[PDB]
Ligand binder design. Structure first.
Ligand SMILES: Cc1cc(C(=O)N[C@@H](CC(=O)N2CCCC[C@@H]2C)C(=O)N[C@@H](C)C(=O)NCc2ccc(F)cc2F)no1
Ligand SMILES: Cc1cc(C(=O)N[C@@H](CC(=O)N2CCCC[C@@H]2C)C(=O)N[C@@H](C)C(=O)NCc2ccc(F)cc2F)no1
Ligand SMILES: Cc1cc(C(=O)N[C@@H](CC(=O)N2CCCC[C@@H]2C)C(=O)N[C@@H](C)C(=O)NCc2ccc(F)cc2F)no1
Ligand SMILES: Cc1cc(C(=O)N[C@@H](CC(=O)N2CCCC[C@@H]2C)C(=O)N[C@@H](C)C(=O)NCc2ccc(F)cc2F)no1
Ligand SMILES: Cc1cc(C(=O)N[C@@H](CC(=O)N2CCCC[C@@H]2C)C(=O)N[C@@H](C)C(=O)NCc2ccc(F)cc2F)no1
Ligand SMILES: Cc1cc(C(=O)N[C@@H](CC(=O)N2CCCC[C@@H]2C)C(=O)N[C@@H](C)C(=O)NCc2ccc(F)cc2F)no1
Ligand SMILES: Cc1cc(C(=O)N[C@@H](CC(=O)N2CCCC[C@@H]2C)C(=O)N[C@@H](C)C(=O)NCc2ccc(F)cc2F)no1
Ligand SMILES: Cc1cc(C(=O)N[C@@H](CC(=O)N2CCCC[C@@H]2C)C(=O)N[C@@H](C)C(=O)NCc2ccc(F)cc2F)no1
Lengths: 223, 223, 223, 222, 223, 222, 222
């Protein structure tokens, strides 16, 4: 797996590959690892597919459960701490092989400056978190390759499109070096999923946009 | 890894992928797994890269050694036996992780019928061997996918050229389902290597031919 | 074991073999592994016979329990989640050898287009699941042979007849390469079972239809 | 695997299946497990394919080696002893998975009575051996089914052809109950192999003959 | 450790950091890991400091010993094989913690195509080797970061100067993300080792030149 | 990690590096390991990032919980006992890798002398504690280097400013000899955090001041 | 143990403590850890006493053996290599508790600058070595205290006498923080040993001078 997230002016983008493996064997081509967890939050999870999807579903339900009970959504800090509590709670099963490493992207409607209201929170397996200040982050087996790619491309991000393209290209590099991260499948038309989030909320990115970017990156590296 | 070999009327063909891994990490893109071991035999080996290459080089040396000492090459049976002995002798290292699983494709200059002089010999890790009589064989992490593909595609083998297209297609199905087997890389121009052996000897198939078959396969799958 | 499921225009088909083993010894010849679990759902389980049959039985009971208590059946998404929760809850026992891997086929009377209302859901030993979008899937010790067979035969599926044929022939290839999958027994008159589901519901394919399909396949492969 | 051997009046027969497995996976359909190791002797071996075949080859080479050196072939007792020693030598390796379990069938040209010149000798993994006096024997994962089938079928053996048929039928029952033992494959045309030995020596039974016997058995059970 | 090597028109460059650790403790600041092993060859080794140094020394002696014994240096192929045999020979010790993972750069005075006589050979711990064809490679705990850095920077290599700049910048990225790799030390005036090889031989890059490259990279990233 | 604390006339200072690692790999550059845990108290924590931060958070909530329930803040001794009990409660987890090892710097508003009222308390992983009488202390993988530095530089501490200088230079030496301790990052502009506590309470030290001191030490060494 | 070595203008000095322990128990008070191995070379070894002493003895015999065989002494490099090889040879024993970690000081009579002819080489348990370029080094359980002490004191080293003072004071700090390093015993009159090496060769430092410097350090810290 590789999930990436990066801040662009007035928003965040998160994107994730579509591969599922069992050892060397490809068990999935179309898995979704990035979920809109609320109107201003998307979560992307690496590790054991079953636990990862379960984390995403549970998290979204907890957030909305608080919203309906108390009349108001959690503060972003609260959302961070609830995800962190979930990860810590899973530490023992993680060490037994039921792993879930999340990566949180969101838009803080209570931030002062909308330009930097985007938030990228990374986590370790003990529940430790860090709000990232350098613009991008990644999780999963290809996360190193993706992070080193964004280290070189991130300065190209000036809007939603350039950010979405840098994310997709970072996933392209990850799949190029990590066999457990799926690259774009142009025979099948399967492409990484991506969620973008700004003041108008969190939306899924149309498959055709990501398809187009993938093709441009491929051609760019061919000739 | 996936190595495939198959008989066609008058000859035999063996093709191998190009990928190297260390866990999920892709460590090589252009490794070679099929070697012309003598004028009428090619050997393709799956397993630890160092041990595979060493096997091919030593086997080829031993065959030519016998040839120059005795004024004649070994019978095809003898060549089988020397490979089987090499494998058996490596069994204990294989048990500790230094594995070499070979696959033998050759042409028997002493067979009565030159159209059925092609030989495909598979091996197990204990040095057992079987002269494959159903037309095709594969070894490596992707070999069950490649076998099951060739099972359906083998009626298309009517000469060396459709044999080569079927070998390349089997390797394509293998890369489709096994992340330790590398598919054709159209960005970089790296394709499986292939050897074709007939009455005139064993010769390497040029890259551009395999590339052409690969693009035909991809453009067929892609509708 | 091999259980296969595949979609055809307007519905879905699931079929399973009849063999039971304890090691190399054949302990059963007519066991049933594919059950109609409700009017529009069939479940096919691989693993330990006792746990597989128990899963089918308890799952069907659970679904009907819901429908009687609330006056309406679970959504298809509900059904998926309930099965997944069963598998997950059985994990530890599975790690101790009491394994039960289901494969779920169904027709969703609440889908938009009843011609793509077919559903194929595969699972892993954790609760993890995936809705198959490529038209076929298989579970059990023959699932790789069967899926690779279907990868080559699926283009022939244009209706339930060709769907049932491709399913029975995938089970034939499976039995052909996997000794723990039983092929058609022409001496005893024992054949894989099948369920077909379309907008009229789920129905057991009568044994004689499977028999003549099996005979056709065999004669195909003899000449 | 299943290897069977039985005595008929004036000779012996041995037949073996053709299946090779790795766990549940069928890895071979045409392996040969019964070999003519000399003009009056056949060995059939169960276990690890490479070791089975290596044993047959080295055993035949060894016997013929004695024959060329000393100008005369080993007594039947000496052949038994050489096989038994070869099996005992493999014990450590066999405990690690490189198992070879032989079954010997021969005709003793120095026996007293040609009617009782047939020999069937069974072995265990320690090299212990026994000369079968009850008419038949078998070795491999299917051997119990083959032997319980022969126990009921042996009274039909009255000549070479009925003994061959009983052997093929025993192997058929073995395959019916043991998945590591391959039955007749009518689609591909692969059948058990068989050697028959009498006063004129050991020969390979032709594949057609076994095919007919198998088709007869199948039809009879349908 | 991080060692990088890359090709440029007419030559090759290799460079390595200066750091030695014992767990988290810094135990050396001026260590040297890149050695001119003969007039046209340099070796950079990661792993246990004592093994790596010993490997370099012994390998140099081996090459020159052949050269004096036979009146002629080994082919480049033979130098590869000899290093590989040395590594294989060290496998068991490597598994007990006495690792030496070499990287080979050279200039082949007998190159078929005198245009591309530069050579870069990588090695795994079993003695497997591969002649890099994509222009660069790295070895050591920082090697993934250097390889992704160079993946982004390699197009800027058009001569020995730019090639040396990209090498040192890859080292800088490596130390940026790997505490086991030492960055430049402007306080003590300690910088990475480098060697550059072309048709006129192999030469140690003066420290001052690496100092200027380090200062250019640092100012580039300060603003 | 290195956390340092040292007493100066009328106060105390605590300062911590910004590095997080997983093995050799740098996983964070800007983490905060030093926390104002109440108006007169800071805690620096070495160990597992998640457990460390959790300790600081829980501890601050606990001290204020007492204060709001009882109308008055815990004595300094009680504050120590509550941290120590927390550490002891975590010993089982700490043996399995989830380690939090704290260092307490406070100002005791109840002490006799408002110039020697600064308090530095060190802890061990069982919750044992000691009130440091020799003026300075440190914790974390770099704590030995930091302490051997302050041993030499502590005579230069005459006020809050010089004490902060010695604290940042101790952190510098720690970074020089321990790769799990981050040194000043002039390119990115990340510097150790520091808190100073005196009679006026605990206050965060402005980054720009720590940056100044770091540049002065860096220049001094070259 | 703590063994220190540092360069002064035109020479080098090496000093070591006198303590031998078994667990917590003091088992020796006057052990010598620093040995003149030849006219221009001194070696000090931490680790297992028996092995350390055996290493120093056999090493001196090795160097003198080469000198009498070849009519000339080894180059400084050669002496290094011989020690490194000896250390690598003991690696397995060391891994099982029979450890020998040496520190090497010398004056290279074949050096270019007579003032840059001092030489300090450190080693790891695998036979890795490094020629130290920053002026000082130390080995033993107290070598981090000793090296951090010398990091701060090395500026005061301007001649051989000041260098000796820094060596002894570094050892003193080592003893202050490491119970396996023995500080000056004024009651018994046992003090560290010290070799000085310059162009005129290597010499034992008289005990009276080290005792003098020791009491100066002690009185200085009260
Ligand atoms: C005890 C156990 C482990 C497994 C296992 O390996 N399960 C695989 C997943 C898998 O084979 N599947 C096919 C069948 C239907 C469900 C699913 C899609 C996995 O989890 N593999 C890991 C290595 C993986 O690929 N994880 C990627 C991933 C991450 C987040 C996410 F949401 C989905 C994902 F696939 N199963 O049981
Ligand atoms: C202890 C240890 C393990 C390994 C290891 O996994 N070594 C890899 C090989 C590797 O990482 N390499 C890049 C650097 C240079 C040489 C080579 C190309 C391997 O053997 N991996 C296996 C899984 C593999 O991919 N095998 C495929 C293969 C088959 C035949 C062949 F000739 C070459 C191949 F790469 N090495 O040391
Ligand atoms: C703890 C334990 C397990 C077993 C065991 O392996 N029990 C076998 C089943 C068996 O010997 N039996 C005959 C008598 C009774 C009924 C049944 C039919 C099995 O579970 N074998 C597994 C490997 C198997 O063959 N599974 C195929 C299968 C799948 C789904 C299903 F519904 C039924 C099936 F037989 N025995 O004890
Ligand atoms: C350590 C090890 C074991 C094995 C293994 O299981 N090897 C299988 C054999 C196999 O997969 N093969 C195909 C490829 C080449 C040769 C052979 C034909 C086996 O030995 N299986 C055993 C259980 C078996 O099936 N034995 C039947 C048998 C008996 C005698 C004989 F001569 C030949 C046979 F196949 N391989 O390495
Ligand atoms: C690794 C292994 C185990 C065995 C094993 O248990 N071998 C059995 C003997 C056996 O199955 N056989 C038939 C096939 C040919 C030879 C022999 C006749 C045994 O040794 N069983 C023991 C428990 C036994 O019965 N011992 C009785 C005995 C004592 C003395 C003697 F001379 C002969 C005997 F059979 N053999 O190899
Ligand atoms: C059995 C054993 C291993 C070690 C150990 O970890 N020894 C360290 C090296 C060390 O502490 N040293 C200082 C004193 C002498 C010289 C040397 C420089 C190491 O090998 N560390 C590894 C992790 C390392 O940093 N390796 C980097 C490296 C690579 C190539 C090279 F040539 C030199 C290097 F230091 N010690 O004992
Ligand atoms: C069981 C387990 C351990 C770990 C682990 O090693 N976790 C690392 C921390 C890490 O990789 N992270 C990035 C993303 C999330 C948040 C955090 C910042 C750690 O704890 N490393 C230790 C060695 C460490 O660096 N501790 C330093 C430290 C001390 C106090 C503090 F408050 C914060 C700190 F980072 N993960 O799971
Ligand atoms: C089972 C066993 C224990 C030991 C052991 O610990 N042996 C001690 C030495 C000791 O107890 N002794 C008194 C009796 C006479 C010999 C000596 C003086 C040691 O080696 N302890 C280590 C920890 C130590 O203190 N080493 C200091 C040292 C270093 C170098 C040197 F040359 C001399 C030294 F004493 N050896 O074997």
């Amino acid at each position: 797996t590789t999930i990436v997230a990066l801040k662009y002016p007035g928003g965040v983008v998160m994107a994730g590959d579509r591969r599922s493996t069992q050892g060397n064997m490809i068990s999935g081509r179309d898995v979704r690892k990035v979920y809109i967890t609320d109107d201003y939050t998307a979560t992307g999870i690496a590790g054991t597919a079953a636990v990862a999807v379960e984390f995403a579903r549970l998290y979204a339900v907890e957030l909305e459960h608080y919203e309906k009970l108390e009349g108001v959504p959690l503060t972003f800090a609260g959302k961070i701490n609830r995800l962190a509590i979930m990860v810590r709670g899973n530490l023992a099963a993680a060490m037994q092989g039921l792993l879930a490493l999340p990566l949180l992207a969101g838009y803080d409607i209570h931030a002062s400056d909308p330009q930097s209201a985007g938030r990228i929170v990374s986590f370790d397996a003990a529940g430790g978190w860090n709000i990232e200040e350098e613009g991008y982050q990644a999780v999963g087996s290809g996360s190193l390759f993706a992070k080193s790619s964004m280290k070189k491309l991130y300065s190209q991000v000036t809007d939603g499109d350039s950010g979405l393209r840098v994310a997709v290209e970072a996933l392209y590099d990850a799949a190029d070096d990590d066999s457990a991260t799926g690259g774009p499948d142009l025979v099948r038309g399967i492409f990484p999923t991506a969620v973008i989030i700004d003041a108008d909320g969190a939306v899924d990115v149309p498959e055709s946009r990501i398809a187009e970017l993938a093709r441009a990156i491929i051609e760019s590296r061919s000739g």
